[PDB]
Amino acid sequence: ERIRDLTSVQGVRENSLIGYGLVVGLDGTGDQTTQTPFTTQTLNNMLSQLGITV
Amino acid sequence: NYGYQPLFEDRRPRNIGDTLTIVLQENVSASKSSSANASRDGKTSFGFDTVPRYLQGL
């Protein structure tokens, strides 16, 4: 059980994924949204997608 | 079904038939000008009002 600990197999590799999201349900410890316009912009985007146009 | 739609991404046109708003704001202004000039004035004179005798022949 040492070769598996010393080498890696060609083609058997890991990639990296990134994305943007919103986290809700905080107890008043979220963004101020006055210094972060993108939070409100993306919340409005989500609401518009769901059918609400602010 | 209209396919996958991102939740937080800004609404952009992605496929054929999608609409987009163009704000036409064009302001173009070009100009050019040039000139050239040249001048030349020349005056010359010589007169012998009173000629002494020894200079008369000349």
Coordinates of C-alpha atoms in Angstrom, one line a residue, chain B:
Chain B
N1 CA -39.2 24.1 -21.1
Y2 CA -36.9 27.0 -21.7
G3 CA -33.8 25.2 -20.5
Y4 CA -31.4 26.1 -17.7
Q5 CA -31.6 29.7 -16.4
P6 CA -29.0 31.2 -14.0
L7 CA -30.4 32.6 -10.8
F8 CA -28.0 35.4 -9.9
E9 CA -26.4 36.2 -13.3
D10 CA -27.5 39.3 -15.0
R11 CA -30.1 38.8 -17.8
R12 CA -28.2 38.7 -21.0
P13 CA -29.1 37.6 -24.5
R14 CA -27.6 34.1 -25.1
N15 CA -29.5 32.5 -28.0
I16 CA -31.1 33.4 -31.3
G17 CA -34.3 35.4 -30.8
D18 CA -33.2 37.0 -27.5
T19 CA -33.7 40.8 -27.2
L20 CA -31.2 43.5 -26.2
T21 CA -31.5 47.2 -25.6
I22 CA -29.2 49.5 -27.6
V23 CA -28.8 53.1 -26.4
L24 CA -27.9 55.0 -29.5
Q25 CA -25.5 57.7 -28.4
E26 CA -23.2 58.9 -31.2
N27 CA -21.1 62.1 -31.1
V28 CA -18.4 62.4 -33.8
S29 CA -16.7 65.6 -34.8
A30 CA -13.6 66.1 -37.0
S31 CA -12.0 69.2 -38.3
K32 CA -8.9 70.4 -40.2
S33 CA -7.6 73.7 -41.5
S34 CA -4.4 75.1 -43.0
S35 CA -3.1 78.2 -44.7
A36 CA 0.1 79.6 -46.3
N37 CA 1.3 83.0 -47.4
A38 CA 4.3 84.7 -48.9
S39 CA 5.1 88.4 -49.5
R40 CA 7.9 90.4 -51.1
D41 CA 8.2 94.1 -51.4
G42 CA 11.2 95.9 -52.9
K43 CA 11.8 99.6 -53.6
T44 CA 15.0 101.2 -54.9
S45 CA 16.0 104.7 -56.1
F46 CA 18.9 106.9 -56.8
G47 CA 18.9 110.6 -57.8
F48 CA 21.5 113.2 -58.5
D49 CA 19.7 116.5 -57.9
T50 CA 22.9 118.7 -58.3
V51 CA 25.8 117.3 -60.2
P52 CA 29.2 118.9 -59.8
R53 CA 31.1 119.8 -63.0
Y54 CA 33.8 117.1 -62.7
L55 CA 31.0 114.5 -62.3
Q56 CA 28.8 115.8 -65.1
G57 CA 30.0 113.4 -67.8
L58 CA 29.2 110.5 -65.5

